[PDB]
XYZ file of C-alpha atoms in Angstrom:
150
model
C -199.625 -30.462 -77.904
C -202.890 -32.341 -78.499
C -204.273 -31.514 -75.047
C -203.345 -27.852 -75.483
C -204.616 -27.854 -79.070
C -207.923 -29.546 -78.237
C -208.275 -27.259 -75.228
C -208.118 -24.070 -77.321
C -210.572 -25.531 -79.827
C -212.968 -26.159 -76.946
C -213.294 -22.547 -75.779
C -213.819 -23.741 -72.212
C -215.970 -21.472 -70.063
C -215.784 -23.407 -66.794
C -214.134 -26.253 -64.862
C -216.588 -28.795 -66.279
C -215.584 -27.935 -69.865
C -211.917 -28.406 -69.017
C -212.620 -31.822 -67.474
C -214.568 -33.023 -70.535
C -211.718 -32.051 -72.865
C -209.354 -34.198 -70.782
C -211.798 -37.125 -70.786
C -212.128 -36.885 -74.572
C -208.348 -36.930 -75.015
C -208.089 -40.037 -72.814
C -210.658 -41.717 -75.082
C -208.563 -40.758 -78.115
C -205.360 -42.113 -76.560
C -207.111 -45.449 -75.987
C -207.855 -45.726 -79.704
C -211.418 -44.403 -79.854
C -212.311 -42.475 -83.024
C -214.742 -39.582 -82.498
C -217.746 -38.814 -84.661
C -218.483 -35.165 -85.408
C -214.924 -34.253 -86.333
C -212.470 -34.995 -89.154
C -209.387 -33.986 -87.163
C -209.468 -35.811 -83.830
C -206.184 -34.340 -82.588
C -207.002 -30.735 -83.500
C -210.628 -29.914 -82.665
C -213.461 -31.117 -80.441
C -216.454 -32.855 -82.033
C -219.323 -30.561 -83.016
C -222.082 -30.389 -80.408
C -219.763 -31.902 -77.793
C -221.295 -29.289 -75.493
C -225.087 -28.979 -75.765
C -227.353 -27.136 -73.300
C -225.805 -28.014 -69.943
C -224.745 -31.535 -70.891
C -221.902 -33.035 -72.900
C -222.042 -35.783 -75.497
C -219.083 -37.616 -77.026
C -219.595 -40.426 -79.572
C -216.934 -42.889 -80.717
C -216.184 -45.944 -82.781
C -213.218 -48.229 -82.113
C -211.154 -50.513 -84.400
C -211.284 -53.205 -81.695
C -215.093 -52.970 -81.646
C -216.318 -53.011 -85.263
C -220.080 -52.831 -85.686
C -220.670 -50.756 -82.555
C -220.569 -47.175 -81.305
C -219.874 -45.869 -77.806
C -221.433 -42.743 -76.311
C -220.302 -40.770 -73.269
C -223.109 -38.673 -71.817
C -221.713 -36.308 -69.204
C -224.080 -34.707 -66.765
C -223.191 -31.926 -64.349
C -224.610 -33.084 -61.010
C -223.775 -30.485 -58.376
C -220.099 -30.116 -57.837
C -219.911 -33.510 -59.586
C -219.799 -34.511 -63.234
C -221.341 -37.900 -64.016
C -219.868 -39.731 -67.001
C -222.346 -42.219 -68.464
C -221.013 -44.825 -70.902
C -223.539 -46.286 -73.336
C -223.121 -48.850 -76.118
C -225.091 -49.105 -79.366
C -225.069 -52.365 -81.345
C -227.489 -53.174 -84.180
C -229.648 -50.203 -83.177
C -229.962 -51.553 -79.643
C -228.892 -49.336 -76.746
C -227.173 -50.869 -73.731
C -226.030 -49.062 -70.598
C -222.493 -49.994 -69.612
C -221.203 -47.911 -66.731
C -221.253 -44.617 -64.851
C -218.382 -42.696 -63.276
C -218.636 -39.807 -60.827
C -215.909 -37.177 -61.180
C -215.250 -34.091 -59.056
C -213.789 -31.348 -61.308
C -212.413 -29.424 -58.316
C -209.980 -32.285 -57.648
C -208.422 -32.002 -61.106
C -209.095 -28.462 -62.345
C -207.749 -25.100 -61.202
C -210.742 -23.080 -62.374
C -208.998 -19.754 -61.757
C -206.446 -20.444 -64.491
C -208.623 -21.636 -67.390
C -207.310 -18.961 -69.756
C -203.679 -20.002 -69.310
C -201.540 -23.007 -70.273
C -203.021 -26.473 -69.686
C -200.035 -27.264 -67.465
C -201.333 -24.491 -65.209
C -204.875 -25.856 -65.235
C -204.775 -29.616 -64.701
C -203.692 -31.124 -61.389
C -203.259 -34.800 -60.493
C -203.508 -35.837 -64.155
C -202.018 -39.305 -63.662
C -204.558 -39.757 -60.878
C -207.527 -38.833 -63.070
C -206.132 -40.815 -66.002
C -205.858 -44.111 -64.110
C -209.243 -43.485 -62.542
C -210.965 -42.819 -65.888
C -209.169 -45.665 -67.695
C -209.474 -48.277 -64.932
C -213.074 -47.486 -64.030
C -214.469 -46.455 -67.410
C -212.388 -46.998 -70.562
C -211.167 -50.547 -69.973
C -214.451 -51.850 -68.519
C -216.202 -50.293 -71.527
C -213.860 -51.986 -74.011
C -214.198 -55.357 -72.261
C -217.976 -55.043 -72.056
C -218.086 -54.151 -75.758
C -215.814 -57.007 -76.864
C -218.101 -59.430 -75.017
C -221.242 -58.004 -76.611
C -219.551 -58.409 -79.993
C -218.652 -62.038 -79.266
C -214.926 -61.311 -79.487
C -212.033 -62.530 -77.300
C -210.856 -59.967 -74.734
C -207.897 -57.779 -75.721
C -206.414 -57.544 -72.229
């Protein structure tokens, strides 16, 4: 219900929008808390979609004293997810991930149920988590001089 709820809040216009919503939900399910919204399970953060690019900002209970930013850039048929960490007003690049929306989105069905729209979800989920979320958390923990949580 959260995916479908967040999806309708998003007012997706294209395949890229639909992919970003899914990415955001995966961040939420890993424990990240989004800035720009007071109801993380109901609506997308304000300005999540700004002039061709997407920006998602989070804090995490396992990473006190830091904030994580996903900057998502449409490059071609690709979407590039950039993960960036801010600690003590210092910005550090963490990781990038290249995603191909066509592999996971049925763009012809964006107005329908999310079950009709997303394909190979478990594929995209383990890709995003294994190559972005977990490396980001581990990188952050290190930067914060904390023991790893995995």
